[model samples]
Target chain A: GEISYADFEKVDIRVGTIVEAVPFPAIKVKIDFGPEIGIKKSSAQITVHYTPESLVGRQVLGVVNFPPRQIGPFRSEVLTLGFADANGDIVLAAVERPVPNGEKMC
Target chain B: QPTAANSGEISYADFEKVDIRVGTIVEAVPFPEARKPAIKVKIDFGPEIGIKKSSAQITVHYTPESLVGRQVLGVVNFPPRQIGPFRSEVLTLGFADANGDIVLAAVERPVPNGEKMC
Candidate 1:
């Protein structure tokens, strides 16, 4: 069934700045999917295709509502998105068009 | 210089029409039933959306064991789909890379198990 409009309004997604990227070989870099949603931390296996330097300034889409997870050691709060590469490495998702830092992927 | 596509806006209503949520992979198995080498996933979207099934040609990068407990982006509002004996409840979402293989959509971090993607 098509959901009522009221149900959709409850979802809170946003864009945030990619404030920093570290060799979180232990911890993934921080992502700001947006405000209202706030900043979140993640653990990514992006090493095959991403480096800390390359990821520092990228804007990614994320769901800010989930709580957080304790990875091998670090805590992950948002899920990073990307398409699969030929090697199955993770290539990050960029906006079809950059809507805004925290714009909903509508 | 600044980029162009990053400067648009859609209302909350726009975001909601598409029902997306985070879920953990409870099972991942090869679908020989599928002509293409696709992986079938049974995901737990928590209480609200419950468990939904999906199929994607993600074998190039993901093995069945690697996906357990991982959170993925899913479109739950799309009606059910029939794939042979498997009934897919949600659409596993992802973006295409330069090469066009199917990469999965992921949350930057772990959120509530069933939280909707805003």
Candidate 2:
């Protein structure tokens, strides 16, 4: 089935750079999406191949329009996107190169 | 430079409806016949779904040589589009750079072809 631009327009996917990462309780990250989006926090289970130290300063994509999700004590403001590796581990989705933060996918 | 803002809020179901996946380019060829500079590439989506074709306007930053063997993301459920002479089976996805050139969506680490974007 073909989807209209209206359909595709609903989800707001944006590019952001990880500014902070933590792994104590669970893997969590803070992404900087420029001034408009500010620094949004996300709770990601991307710990298989990614350590908190490895995530900082890295660029990744996220679904920015989803309602905030609360997992336990963390309020996840964005859905950090990734693809599953062969073992079902998360592999962050990225760009061929850097783009401005908060740039929407057209 | 500042970028454009995002669209309105969407339900999770709406996002789930679009089937985006990772695929590796198996072959790429120049499409000098098209009005815009584009490439006709064959992407392997894995054994079950097999290979699919796409016509992408990424010539500003990509060459047919650079595209081959690269893992890229695409929206797989879009209806096939007929270009000047080619049938594009998938929407090879990317965001725009400062100059409005298409920058391909990629997996920071290798993922199997046909893995759904989640």
Candidate 3:
């Protein structure tokens, strides 16, 4: 079903850069969404195709308005957005060029 | 206080309502007729969704020549929007830069065209 523009605007998705990453079974990444949103953390299940070192400094899109959820010991503050490949491994959502952090996707 | 800029929290189902997909640019040209500077592009969203047209206001950072063959994300489920003489079938997604120019949304690596964003 087609959605109204208001429906699309309800989800707050923003661009951010990965500042730090580590594997806690699932990869935990600290992302900087610039001055307005500041830095936030997410736990991503992208180990099949991405490594911690390769993820740092890369710009990624994330859902910023979702309520934080606890994943074992980690509190995932945002939903790291992605699409699945043929093999079902996650591929990160990105920007064609660098944009300022905290820019909202429209 | 909300931690994010947009204060409201939404359910997962709310996010799913907007269908976003990846497509590769098949053609692009300057739209001089547009009220604002824009590029008209045809994109191939693979076999399922086929080709769609969009008018993107990305002139600050892109040229029609620079856009062809690039993979971009678009909202495929929106109703067609009539812009002047052209009918735009999809909303090419992007984020604003520091200067507020449109920067296109993309995939970190190539995924099959028409794959839905999750």
Residue A52 lDDT, candidate 2, scale 0-100: 87
Q: lDDT value for candidate 1?
A: 0.66
Between prediction 2 and prediction 3, the one with superior lDDT is 3
Give the higher-TM-score candidate: 1 or 3.
3
- Candidate 1 off by > 4 Å: A3-55, A62-106, B1-11
Give the clash count for model 3: 0
Q: Model 2 over residues A4-105: C-alpha lDDT tens digits? A: 666777778899999999984358899999879888888887888889889999999999888787888878898899988999888899988999898887
Best by DockQ: 3
Residue B113 in candidate 2, Cα distance off native in Å: 0.8
Estimate the TM-score for candidate 3.
0.93
Cα lDDT tens digits, model 1, B1-118, are: 8666552334445554766677788999999899888999999988777888888878876789998887777778766778898898877865444455555667544556676543
Give me the iRMSD of candidate 1, please: 10.1
lDDT of 1 by residue, A1-106 (tens): 5554345444444444566777763327787654555667876667866688777877776556555678767777776654444355555555422344555533
lDDT against the true structure, each candidate = 0.66, 0.87, 0.91
Clashing pairs in 2: none
Lowest summed lDDT across 10 adjacent residues in model 2 chain B is found at B4-13
